[PDB]
């Protein structure tokens, strides 16, 4: 089969809540790859969120620092993005992508997941 990245863990949650996104990787030696996370809200351009390098170090966009956490489990061929303290402005399709290039630019990523919808509502 072909290389595949499959996101899961999205849904609809109220502001202040949490979701745990995951990305299951098949077809490559996952431990060699950096895993990046991007998001696209309707009407806006896709933007970098976070990445975890093959070395285990992490980088976050400024607007998510201290709220989102990227991790990986190489034995499970899985990357994770924990979304805490969610805000309505975090509503978007979230994508995982992988590359052996270390960068925040989407142009250098080789494989992309299909995306998982994250919707954060306000209570009424």
């Amino acid at each position: 089969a072909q290389v595949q990245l499959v996101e899961s863990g999205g849904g609809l949650v109220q502001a202040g809540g949490s979701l745990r996104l995951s990305c299951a990787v098949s077809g490559r030696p996952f431990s060699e790859y950096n895993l990046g996370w991007f998001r696209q809200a309707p009407g806006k351009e896709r933007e970098f969120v976070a990445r975890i390098r093959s070395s285990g170090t992490t980088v976050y966009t400024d607007s998510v620092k201290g709220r989102f956490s990227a991790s990986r489990d190489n034995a499970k061929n899985m990357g994770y993005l924990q979304l805490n303290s969610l805000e309505p402005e975090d509503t978007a399709v979230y994508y995982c992508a992988m590359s052996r290039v270390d960068t925040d630019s989407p142009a250098f990523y080789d494989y992309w997941g299909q995306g998982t919808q994250v919707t954060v509502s306000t209570p009424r």
Binding site: S8, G10, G11, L12, V13, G115, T119, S121, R124
Partner: protein, 214 residues
């Protein structure tokens, strides 16, 4: 968490068709963002029914429609409070089915309550004679109107003798609290009866539904 990628539901329907009263209880599950679901329904009062199951099958879940990212998923956004819907099906031979429904969320599961009235089905027609064999795939034209979401379907039932039997269906969907309505689009639906006992007092269904731009 309000809607997860896997969700269960429970459904109760009370109905009358050509004066025959009945009740149905059911349970279902599916993947709301993938647009797939199943249900198992049991006739609990008034069984066996003297009419075709197929007129009841579309009344048993539009929170499970896969939507493109740029089409607001109004019915998902209605939760946790939920939504109500009202439907009229006008069949080609003059049979009429009117349906009202309430959808809510309780302890992590969707709860559906359905009331149905069918009238004027001819005694020798395919509904009262149980001569139907499932729906063809449908495309529902969705559009905002009057602050609600409306849908219209030209629906087609297969007949056991090889013919077909049509209905014009109109539904109004209204969130309990105001949420963002979409523009006009289509929802493609295919509903299958996957198993049933001999007298259709226990029935299992599967539905796939996906929204697409016009």
């Amino acid at each position: 968490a309000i809607i997860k990628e896997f969700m269960r539901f429970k459904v109760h329907m009370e109905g009358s068709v050509n004066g025959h009263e009945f009740e149905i209880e059911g349970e279902g599950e599916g993947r709301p963002y993938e647009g797939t679901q199943t249900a198992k329904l049991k006739v609990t009062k008034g069984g066996p029914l003297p009419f075709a199951w197929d007129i009841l099958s579309p009344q048993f879940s539009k929170a499970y429609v896969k939507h493109p990212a740029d089409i607001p998923d109004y019915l998902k956004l209605s939760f946790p409070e939920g939504f109500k819907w009202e439907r009229v099906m006008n069949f080609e031979d003059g049979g009429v089915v009117t349906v009202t429904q309430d959808s809510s969320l309780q302890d992590g599961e969707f709860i559906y309550k359905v009331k149905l009235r069918g009238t004027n089905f001819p005694s020798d027609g395919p509904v009262m004679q149980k001569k139907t064999m499932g729906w063809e795939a449908s495309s529902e034209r969705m559009y905002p109107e009057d602050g609600a979401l409306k849908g219209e379907i030209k629906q087609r039932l297969k007949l056991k003798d090889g013919g077909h039997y049509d209905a014009e269906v109109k539904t109004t969907y209204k969130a309990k609290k105001p949420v963002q309505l979409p523009g006009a689009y289509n929802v493609n639906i295919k509903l299958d009866i996957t198993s049933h006992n001999e007298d259709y007092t226990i029935v299992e269904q599967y539905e796939r539904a996906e929204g697409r731009h016009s």
